[PDB]
Amino acid sequence: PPPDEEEQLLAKFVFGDTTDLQENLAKFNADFEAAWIDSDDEKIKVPILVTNKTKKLRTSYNESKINGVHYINRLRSQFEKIYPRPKWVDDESDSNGDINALTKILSTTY
Amino acid sequence: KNSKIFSPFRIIGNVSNGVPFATGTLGSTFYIVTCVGKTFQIYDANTLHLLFVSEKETPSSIVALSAHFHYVYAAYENKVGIYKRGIEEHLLELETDANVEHLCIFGDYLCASTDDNSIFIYKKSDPQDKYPSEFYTKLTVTEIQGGEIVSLQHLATYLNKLTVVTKSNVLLFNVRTGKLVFTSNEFPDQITTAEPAPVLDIIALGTVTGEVIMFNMRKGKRIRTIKIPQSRISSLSFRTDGSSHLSVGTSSGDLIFYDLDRRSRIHVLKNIHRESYGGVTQATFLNGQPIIVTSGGDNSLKEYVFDPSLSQGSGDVVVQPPRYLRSRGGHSQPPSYIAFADSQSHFMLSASKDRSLWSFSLRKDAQSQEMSQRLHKKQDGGRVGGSTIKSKFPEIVALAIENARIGEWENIITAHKDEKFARTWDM
Amino acid sequence: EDEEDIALEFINGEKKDKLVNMNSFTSMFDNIQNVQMDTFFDRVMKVLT
Amino acid sequence: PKVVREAKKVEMTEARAYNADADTAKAA
Amino acid sequence: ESGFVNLYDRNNAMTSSTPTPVAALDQLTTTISNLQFSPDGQILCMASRAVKDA
Amino acid sequence: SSLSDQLAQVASNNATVALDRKRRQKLHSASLIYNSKTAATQDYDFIFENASKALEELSQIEPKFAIFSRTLFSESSISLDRNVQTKEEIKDLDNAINAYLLLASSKWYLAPTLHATEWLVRRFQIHVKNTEMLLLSTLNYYQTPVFKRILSIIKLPPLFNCLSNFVRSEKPPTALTMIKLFNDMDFLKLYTSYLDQCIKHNATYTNQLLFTTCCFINVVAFNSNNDEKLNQLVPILLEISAKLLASKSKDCQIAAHTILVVFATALPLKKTIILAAMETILSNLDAKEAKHSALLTICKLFQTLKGQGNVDQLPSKIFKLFDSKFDTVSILTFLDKEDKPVCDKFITSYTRSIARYDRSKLNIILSLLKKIRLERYEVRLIITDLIYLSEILEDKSQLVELFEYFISINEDLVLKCLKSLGL
């Protein structure tokens, strides 16, 4: 049996529940591919359980060898774990008059 | 011409020459390999104390320098010297008549480059071996693929790939197959520096002009670029301490810190090195530290520090400027006059042609200090006759010094160039 | 007439102005209260010129 | 009193790095 | 003698005939002994023979 | 580091948590309206009752505080505590208090705002959790007892040391201490963050605007002796004026106009930066008083710049936007204004720009030349490029009428100019 809405409000009142306030607080704010590949690096398949760094890199206890594609995938994943990708590269790319001319001249002139 | 009485030991009062240093770590301690002419030195980094020297003078000057964990890779006239703690213990002769220009280490493949665009790939004799002794293959980049080799880089997560940044474009060679696996687009500005970013597959190319372009090899695309005109980018480094900041050391002795997320200029540093000696000849962040080692060609190796942000809320917006931290240096000119200071053979005064006189320590060089040029006040209280601006004293052509009553009155007399008078100095 | 004459006429044509000393804008702090932005801008301009 | 900037000591913490010996591998 | 240099402009002095000084410099406290202009009219120096460094 | 510094850092970590009845008492007596004794002996339910009444009164004033009466002013907002929640939640709470103070920053001299801010101080401990933001909010009211009480109860960040000297006093802080606070450099970076936020939220008003504009004119005033401090002041203040002109408000545009005016008359700036300032002003110029003040900025900027390339003409885009955004009749009225500022280089450059580009309103150029008093080198440049335009263009009646006006006033310069270039 599901609880009633008045019973739920009274339960909030008698319990001191801050979950509804947490949801409102987290919701409400400020309302005013590649260019190349390599065939040898695709067909390459490397051992895993030879060295402790690749013992970190793996995903399965029973797996002992994996191809170069999944190898470089886990390699870039642990590279991501070491250095997280920031916004200026992840989400920023360059590719009447304007208004940021002062900003451009300020960036180009000392 | 070897001797039976004496034997050469080392050089005092030189911390750099213009050759870019190489940083390395032995776990938590960090050491810096910087060339001194025919020789290299290895300093500590937490204290800038000296760690190692090259024991054997190479018959020529070392041109290229690099280092992995416990093995330093020098390149003087034709060969790659592989030393351990400066001890000459492996020589690697390339099969050319040219001079080794570039050098880089990745795994089981050493990549050198002699000046006729000739890359040399050497394979380790064993995966457990420590230095390359076996000649793997020899590549060469002819004039159609790109310009002269600017850099031999090894980008992260690349199976036997080598980034040969040339003057015109960027090449990617698979050194296992010996094949050029990618040719980048031609860039309108001649690349002078290349440095791998901490982000994936992206290099920074600091060209003849100010245009630090963030290029991605995966997209084959210049993602970003920073305008900074009338300046030759001589070094690029990345803050790996935890903030998206880039240091650009121009050849004008300047250092520019950019914040990349706000796309703004954090800070500038003017005349950290002398332009006539090349300005900033190398600038490298400490990996995971807000400490920046800046070496110039002016016989100078500085180590600045970034303070953490004082703003409780803002932080990297209100980020701290660089604070002056520890440096090493010597004369820019050869030393003209030298003198010892005491019987213990612990200090030497050295006057050079740059009109700057320096007390160098002898046991450990952490006491290499320029003698202060700051006048005591006259006994009559009258004015002094001279220019309002300051200047150094002429080069020292004669000198005497005693230590009978040291710390009592003057103990050094220096006859400068073409003076009818000799200046006094307190040691 | 030479370029020396041109430069001397340029020097003669360059006129004076009221400079900005450090003890000029110290009364706006006393006269900020209940003041229009246009009126304060005119105040800045009349103390400048 | 003006804003103080008192200098302090620095310490080089332990740094993590990538393994080029893990990047370079022998062929299959 | 009071150290004062009254500076007028001729373009308005010639038409006012009882002119107002463009400047009233008083940076010296002794007798003005040397008033000298530049050859292009940009610096005026005032010097005193009564006190030193004047 | 030293154990004293480590224990001080862990004390700053353990600041807002009450470890005994005395420290609980200190943080409960930390108030904004009541004194220590009644601030001790009153209760959170009483303060919240007055707070909900105050915030519903603020909701009657403006509909912005309804969301905050919904969320930050509830029974869960009573029963909640900061230290018992997680980091995501405390960040969202900091954002909520930020939005609340950015809304209530324009009614600081109001008793419902005092009551709601006091309840948030004694509940969410904002006077020890976000102090820089609160001071940047109510900084423009330094002559007020509410800000004096804010000072006497606040734990100060290490930047506001003038107010650390001025804390616990009976007099309000001073305009000199304001000039020194804005003379500190990183405080201007904190204020650039604040200006970026309030520009993105459009919560601005004339009192704070005039206040920080006066701080800027006075910091460049005291700094008018040090060239390198002024040059390192260029990027911050120019980014401020740039985003202030990017804003649509006429008050912010006029404040940025005043800021560029004072920065130019303290610093002879560069030609391309000056022309970019004209570009941005002309791009975001919309209103009447903004247009008048912008015309004054054009004249003062073009007068204060001097060098090689002093009276060089306006380029194509800049000149075309100039004639698009401004009328010849409006600038003729501005010349007919009795104050007559020295618009010498601007008027000469503008006339030479029209002579290059338009070659149509020669009557308008004639009226300009007869309305404003010119200078010898400017008329020399005018006669030179007028002779060149007469040689490329067909000989026009209004053109020779300009020449005859030169005959009536100073044919001898026309003679010297023709002898140098022509017959």
F422: left (phi over 0), alpha (psi -120 to 50) or beta: left
- Chain A CB contacts of D25 below 8 Å: 44, 46
Half-sphere exposure of B69 (CA within 13 A, CB side): 12
Q: What is the DSSP letter of B375?
A: P
- Whole-angstrom CA distances from F58 to F63, F69, F73, F95, F99 are 8, 10, 13, 20, 15
How far apart CA F355 and CA E54 sit, in angstroms, is: 53
Q: How far is A28 from chain F (nearest CA, A)?
A: 8
Say which of F254, F266, F376 has its CB closest to residue C9. F376
Are the CB atoms for B334 and B353 separated by under 8 Å? yes
The C-alpha atoms of residue B318 and residue B200 are separated, in whole angstroms, by: 28
Distance from CA of A5 to the nearest CA of B (A): 40
Beta carbons of A20 and F79 less than 8 Å apart: no
B partners (3+ CB pairs within 8 A) are A, D, F
SS3 B117: coil
Q: Which residues of D touch B105 (CB under 8 A)?
A: 20
**How many other β-carbons are positioned within 10 Å of the β-carbon of residue B86?**
19
CB contact under 8 A, C28 and F257: no
Question: Which token pair is B222?
Answer: 């210049």
**Does F284 contact A99 at a Cβ distance shorter than 8 Å?**
yes
Q: Do chains A and C touch (3 or more CB pairs under 8 A)?
A: no
Give the relative orientation of helices F250-266 and C37-48 as an angle to the nearest 10 degrees: 10
Q: How far apart are CA F342 and CA F59, in angstroms?
A: 51
Beta strands in B208-244, from DSSP E residues, in sequence order: 211-216, 221-227, 233-238
F280 and A102 within 8 Å at the Cβ level: the answer is yes
Alpha-carbon gap, residue B275 to F144, rounded angstroms:
55
- Tell me which of B111, B284, B287, B320 to substitute to probe the interface with D (most D C-beta atoms closer than 10 Å): B287
Kindly state the DSSP code that residue F156 receives in the 8-state scheme.
P
| Whether the Cβ atoms of residue A106 and residue F239 lie closer than 8 Å to each other | yes
Please state, in angstroms and rounded to a whole number, the distance separating the CA atoms of residues F396 and B328.
Answer: 74
Chains F/C: 3 or more C-beta pairs closer than 8 A? yes
List the single residue in B265, B310, B313 with the smallest CB-CB distance to F186.
Answer: B310
- Residue carrying structure tokens 């073009």: F302
Burial of F278 (0-12, 13-18, 19+ CB in 10 A): buried
**Inter-residue contact B40 to B64 (CB < 8 Å):** no
**Residues of F whose CB is below 8 A from A109:** 270, 272-273
Q: How many other C-beta atoms can be found within 10 angstroms of the C-beta atom of residue B385? A: 5
Q: Which amino acid is at A9?
A: L
Task: Please tell me the experimental approach by which this structure was elucidated.
Answer: cryo-EM
Distance CA F55, CA F68 (A): 8
DSSP for chain A reads -PPPHHHHHHHHHHHT--HHHHHHHHH-------S---HHHHH-EEESTTSHHHHHH-S-SS--EEEHHHHHHHHHHHHHHHS---HHHHT-------S-HHHHHHHH--
Neighboring chain D residues of F188 at a CB cutoff of 8 Å: none
Asked if D28 has any chain B CB less than 8 Å from its own CB, the reply is: no
| Measured CA distances, B201 to A35, A76, B121, B183, F16 (Å) | 12, 10, 22, 14, 45
Binary contact (A102, F276; C-beta < 8 A): yes
Query: F12 is written with which tokens?
Result: 């700053």
> Could you tell me the two tokens for F107?
């009614």
Distance CA D24, CA A55 (A): 16
Q: CB-based contact (8 Å) between A104 and chain D? A: no
At least 3 CB pairs under 8 A between chains C and E: yes
Helices (H), F71-205: 75-79, 87-103, 111-124, 126-129, 132-137, 145-153, 161-165, 175-183, 185-201
Measured distance CA(F281)–CA(A96) in Å, rounded: 11
| C-alpha distances out from residue F381 to B147, F214, F355, F423, Å | 50, 39, 12, 17
CB burial class (10 A; 0-12, 13-18, 19+) of residue B1?
A: exposed
Closest Cα to residue F293, out of F244, F350, F227, F356?
A: F244
Output the CA torsion sign for E8, E9, E10, E12. Answer: negative
> Looking at the DSSP assignment, which residues form a beta bridge with residue B42?
B33, B52
Subunit partners of chain C (3 or more CB pairs within 8 A): E, F
| Strand positions, DSSP E, B341-410 | 347-352, 357-361, 369-370, 396-401
F239 phi, psi to nearest 5 deg: -65, -35
Distance (Å, rounded) from C-alpha F266 to C-alpha F300? 12
Q: Do A35 and B159 count as a contact with CB atoms less than 8 A apart?
A: no
Total residues found in chain B within this entry: 427
Chain F CA closest to residue C47? F262
3-state SS string for F306-318: CCCCCCCCCCHHH
For residue C11, give the H/E element and its range. Answer: helix C3-13
What are chain D's partners, defined as 3 or more CB pairs within 8 angstroms? A, B, F
**Which amino acid type is present at position F56?**
E
**Inter-chain residue contact A44 with D19, CB threshold 8 Å:** no
**Subunit contact B265:A107, Cβ cutoff 8 A:** yes
Hey, what amino acid is at F244? L
User: B303, B316 in Cβ contact below 8 A?
Assistant: no
Other CB atoms within 10 A of residue B231 CB: 20
Could you say which residues from 217 to 256 on chain F have a Cβ atom under 8 Å away from some Cβ of chain A? 234-235, 238-239, 241-242, 245-246
Is there a contact between F221 and C13 if contact means CB atoms under 8 Å apart?
no
Neighbour order of strands in the sheet with B347-352: B335-340, B347-352, B357-361, B369-370
Q: Do E41 and C16 touch (CB under 8 A)?
A: no
**Would you call F159 and D2 a contact, using CB atoms and an 8 Å cutoff?**
no
Cβ contact A–E (≥3 pairs, < 8 Å): no
Tokens 């450090």 locate to C22
What's this structure's resolution in Å?
Answer: 7.1
